Amino acid sequence: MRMVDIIIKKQNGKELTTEEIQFFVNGYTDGSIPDYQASALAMAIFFQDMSDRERADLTMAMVNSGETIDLSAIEGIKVDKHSTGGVGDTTTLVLAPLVAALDVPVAKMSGRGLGHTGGTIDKLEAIMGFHVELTKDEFIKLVNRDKVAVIGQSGNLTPADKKLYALRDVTGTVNSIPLIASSIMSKKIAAGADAIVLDVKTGAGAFMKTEEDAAELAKAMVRIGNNVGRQTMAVISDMSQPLGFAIGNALEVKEAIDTLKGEGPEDLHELVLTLGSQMVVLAKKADTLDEARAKLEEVMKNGKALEKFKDFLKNQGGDSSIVDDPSKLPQAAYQIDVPAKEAGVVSEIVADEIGVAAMLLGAGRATKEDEIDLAVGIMLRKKVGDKVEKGEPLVTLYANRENVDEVIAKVYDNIRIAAEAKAPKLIHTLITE
């Protein structure tokens, strides 16, 4: 009857105690509390909300529901980035050597999984020889020595969040700030982060549609982090169009190398500097965000970020010479320009659908077992706001296949041309405290 009293307490607008929240999480996790009571509680939470203390308690109970990662043998303050991510987002690829070049320790755990493109592992494996088979001890020593390493992440983290999120998805209770914010924060805390940088996407197609909605979620997650002793900062950035030009795996390694040299697309340059600035301050490698940006800009210009990327590849078996000559990367058999049928200004690129078209070329997994061709993908040749003439290529498709008509039709259906267009501002808001 204890769960029923907990439901009624939340139903009545009361705060749940620390005891009650832990009882619920641990009993739901071990199967003693049934799905139907958890869904009832989640719906009562959807309506009644949770205080900051309840949100912190729920976050940490989910952290403590399964295995946790202890990174304390890695010297320094380990900052991790959570992004809901988006098409063309190379920030993780760029950020790891970029901030490591400032001695920010990057103890990166990632995987593969589904999506429109590969995971970080898939993208890094486009480099020949690169592999993630490290013991924890090797992983610790590589970060301590070179300040960057990647190991495959554990699959036994926050089992309570995996259960609860799946339940929320089939009961109409995803869209609750306390539930979203504790879900995201608990995964990063259980992974051993000392501090956390949030990239909260907003705009057309994103989960948070408005800057105001995204800011509300970011502030809730920042409050949780500070309440549980893991200092947290957020960037609210626009995802209405894909980031950069390259959409794929090897194509994004190639573009990331441009960004690491201080060149490459303007938007990813600005987002990487903005996110990296917060990481550098949180790790206590610069005193202000302006100073952190200056230091990041400088390791871009003097080539130390690129040098860090070479060391990182070399330490885990990859052919580092590909940084100096990215044509060594996997190339696709066919390169097909998709010419614009109309003249004007590119007014919309439906980012999620361009991602699907990339996947339909073989760039990501729709189902769990699918194979990824790391050479295929899409190069955007225009972004929102760019002028375009009839016949001028909108995108270039990189394919291992002769016929891509379905991919062509999807590109055309999801890129609009108007007489006038203005891209959204990329960086909407920063939450630094």
176 annotated ligand-binding residue: no
Environment class of residue 164 by beta-carbon count within 10 Å: exposed (0-12), middle (13-18) or buried (19+)? buried
Up-side HSE of residue 209: CA atoms within 13 Å toward CB? Answer: 1
CA–CA separation, 285 vs 33, rounded Å?
46
CA–CA separation, 246 vs 254, rounded Å?
8
Residue 75 phi, psi dihedral angles, 5° rounding: -60, 135
Q: Cβ of 69: how many Cβ atoms within 10 Å? A: 18
CB-based contacts of 313, cutoff 8 Å, min separation 6? 124, 127, 130, 319, 320, 322, 323
User: Which residues in the chain are classed under CATH 3.90.1170.30?
Assistant: 331-423
CA–CA separation, 122 vs 110, rounded Å?
10
Contact 285, 293 (CB under 8 A): no
Q: Which residue has the tokens 């439906």?
A: 350
108 annotated ligand-binding residue: yes
410 annotated ligand-binding residue: no
Question: 415: which strand partners?
Answer: 349
Helix axes 35-48 and 2-11, enclosed angle (nearest 10): 20
CB-based contacts of 372, cutoff 8 Å, min separation 6? 118, 122, 249, 362, 363, 364, 365
The type of residue at 257 is I
Q: Which residue has the tokens 């938007």?
A: 267
User: Which residues in the chain are classed under CATH 1.20.970.10?
Assistant: 1-68
**Is the C-alpha dihedral spanning 99, 100, 105, 107 positive or negative?**
positive
CA–CA separation, 269 vs 286, rounded Å?
19
Contact 273, 228 (CB under 8 A): no
Experimental method: X-ray
CA–CA separation, 316 vs 296, rounded Å?
24
The structure tokens listed for 401 are 């296949």
Nearest to 378 by CA among 289, 242, 245: 245
CA–CA separation, 323 vs 303, rounded Å?
11
The structure tokens listed for 47 are 């309506």
CA–CA separation, 179 vs 171, rounded Å?
13
CA–CA separation, 248 vs 146, rounded Å?
28
90 annotated ligand-binding residue: yes
CA–CA separation, 379 vs 376, rounded Å?
10
Report the top-level CATH class of 69-330+424-433. alpha beta
User: Which residues in the chain are classed under CATH 3.40.1030.10?
Assistant: 69-330+424-433
255 annotated ligand-binding residue: yes
243 annotated ligand-binding residue: yes
CA–CA separation, 160 vs 399, rounded Å?
41
b/e per residue, 35-67, with b = 16+ CB within 10 A? eebbbbbbbbbbebbbeeebbbbbbbbbbbbbe
Residue 52 phi, psi dihedral angles, 5° rounding: -60, -40
Contact 43, 172 (CB under 8 A): yes
Contact 344, 394 (CB under 8 A): no
CA–CA separation, 372 vs 118, rounded Å?
7
187 annotated ligand-binding residue: yes
374 annotated ligand-binding residue: no
Pairing of strands 232-238, 195-202: parallel
In the 3-class helix/strand/coil scheme, how is the chain assigned residue by residue? Answer: CHHHHHHHHHHCCCCCCHHHHHHHHHHHHCCCCCHHHHHHHHHHHHHHCCCHHHHHHHHHHHHCCCECCCCCCCCCCCEEEEECCCCCCCHHHHHHHHHHCCCCCEEEEECCCCCCCCCHHHHHHCCCCCCCCCCHHHHHHHHHHHCEEEEECCCCECHHHHHHHHHHHCCCCCCCHHHHHHHHHHHHHHCCCCEEEEEEEECCCCCECCHHHHHHHHHHHHHHHHHCCCCEEEEEEECCCCCCCEEECHHHHHHHHHHHCCCCCHHHHHHHHHHHHHHHHHCCCCCCHHHHHHHHHHHHHCCHHHHHHHHHHHHCCCCHHHHCCHHHCCCCCEEEEEECCCCEEEEEECHHHHHHHHHHCCCCCCCCCCCCCCCCEEEECCCCCCEECCCCEEEEEEECCCCCHHHHHHHHHCEEEECCCCCCCCEEEEECC
CA–CA separation, 230 vs 208, rounded Å?
24
Fold of 1-68: 1.20.970
Report resolution in angstroms. Answer: 1.9
Q: What is 331-423's CATH superfamily?
A: Pyrimidine nucleoside phosphorylase-like, C-terminal domain (3.90.1170.30)
Contact 374, 121 (CB under 8 A): no
347 annotated ligand-binding residue: no
Q: Which residues are catalytic?
A: 82, 161, 168, 183, 187
The structure tokens listed for 356 are 């699907």
Q: Which residue has the tokens 């539930």?
A: 179
117 annotated ligand-binding residue: no
Dihedral of the alpha carbons of 22, 69, 94, 195, in degrees to the nearest 10? 50
Up-side HSE of residue 168: CA atoms within 13 Å toward CB? Answer: 20
CA–CA separation, 374 vs 397, rounded Å?
13
61 annotated ligand-binding residue: no
68 annotated ligand-binding residue: no
Nearest to 351 by CA among 210, 211, 239, 200: 239
Nearest to 306 by CA among 258, 252, 251, 243: 258
Q: Cβ of 248: how many Cβ atoms within 10 Å? A: 32
